[PDB]
């Protein structure tokens, strides 16, 4: 599913991301826009042989099992395919784990490079929340 911006904002809000670890909902919508272009189906292979999955481009090195990243972890206890569903529950739950892991939203390269320190409330402008 390719979410709309406010559609995704609503879904992320209902699933508990707004202010989660102190990151306002705009940070999450911004990260999703630049990670996946709001596309739950997005996959992107990494040099190390892991892959990033879903709206928030969660990596198989640590977080989900894809069956082809040897010596990786599955800290979210999910198949990576779970992160590709139109239903973002798995992605959000896994994102909560990631952002709790010491490194905050710096875990997402697109958030660090395109959202951190910017006016992220813009991403939830106009939405009925
Ligand atoms: Cl915000
Ligand atoms: Cl699995
Ligand atoms: Cl959803
Ligand atoms: Cl933090
Ligand atoms: Na893994």
UniProtKB/Swiss-Prot annotation:
Q: Which reaction does it catalyse?
A: Hydrolysis of (1->4)-beta-linkages between N-acetylmuramic acid and N-acetyl-D-glucosamine residues in a peptidoglycan and between N-acetyl-D-glucosamine residues in chitodextrins
Task: Report the SS bond pairs.
Answer: 6-127, 30-115, 64-80, 76-94
Positions that bind substrate: 101
Molecular function (GO) terms listed? beta-N-acetylglucosaminidase activity; identical protein binding; lysozyme activity
Instruction: Tell me any Pfam family this protein matches.
Output: Lys
Single GO cellular component term: cytoplasm
Oxidoreductase among the record's keywords?
no
Q: Does the keyword Chloroplast apply?
A: no
Tell me the active site.
Answer: 35, 52
Q: What is its main location?
A: secreted
Q: What is its EC number?
A: 3.2.1.17
Q: Which UniProt keywords apply?
A: Allergen, Antimicrobial, Bacteriolytic enzyme, Disulfide bond, Glycosidase, Hydrolase, Secreted, Signal
Q: In which tissues is it expressed?
A: In the egg white and polymorphonuclear leukocytes.
Describe the location of the C-type lysozyme domain by residue ranges.
1-129
Q: Where in the cell is it found?
A: Secreted
Q: What enzyme class is recorded for this protein?
A: hydrolase
Q: Which residues form a coiled coil?
A: none
What CDD domains does the record point to? LYZ_C
Gene Ontology BP, a term:
cell wall macromolecule catabolic process
Source taxon at top rank: Eukaryota
Physiological role: Lysozymes have primarily a bacteriolytic function; those in tissues and body fluids are associated with the monocyte-macrophage system and enhance the activity of immunoagents. Has bacteriolytic activity against M.luteus.
Quaternary structure annotation from Swiss-Prot or TrEMBL: Monomer.
Give the family from UniProt. Answer: Belongs to the glycosyl hydrolase 22 family.
Note from the entry: Lysozyme C is capable of both hydrolysis and transglycosylation; it also shows a slight esterase activity. It acts rapidly on both peptide-substituted and unsubstituted peptidoglycan, and slowly on chitin oligosaccharides.
Q: Per its record, how is this protein called by name?
A: Lysozyme C
**Taxonomically, what lineage is the organism?**
Eukaryota, Metazoa, Chordata, Craniata, Vertebrata
């Amino acid at each position: 599913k390719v979410f709309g911006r406010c559609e995704l904002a609503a879904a992320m809000k209902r699933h508990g991301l707004d202010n989660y670890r102190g990151y306002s909902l705009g940070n999450w919508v911004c990260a999703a826009k630049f990670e996946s272009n709001f596309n739950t189906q997005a996959t992107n292979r990494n040099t190390d042989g892991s892959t990033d999955y879903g709206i928030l481009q969660i990596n198989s090195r640590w977080w989900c099992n894809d069956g082809r990243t040897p010596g990786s972890r599955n800290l979210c206890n999910i198949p990576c395919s779970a992160l590709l569903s139109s239903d973002i529950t798995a992605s959000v739950n896994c994102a909560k784990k990631i952002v709790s892991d010491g490194n905050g939203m710096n875990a997402w390269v697109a958030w660090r490079n395109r959202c951190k320190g910017t006016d992220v409330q813009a991403w939830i402008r106009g939405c009925r929340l």
